[PDB]
Design a protein around this motif. Sequence first.
Motif: not given
Length: 43
Positions: A9-16, A30-36, A41-42
């Motif tokens: 997904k281009p554009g953006r998401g919320d960094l949690w 929908s989300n993508c996950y990048k520990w820690p 998404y969306p």
Amino acid sequence: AAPCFCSGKPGRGDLWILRGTCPGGYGYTSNCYKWPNICCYPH
């Protein structure tokens, strides 16, 4: 929340931050996950 892109997904998401899952009350599904951390998404 972040301009941070997700995978596919281009554009953006919320960094949690170091969450294994996103809050259920927000509206994600929908989300993508990048520990820690994560970005979520969306967008």
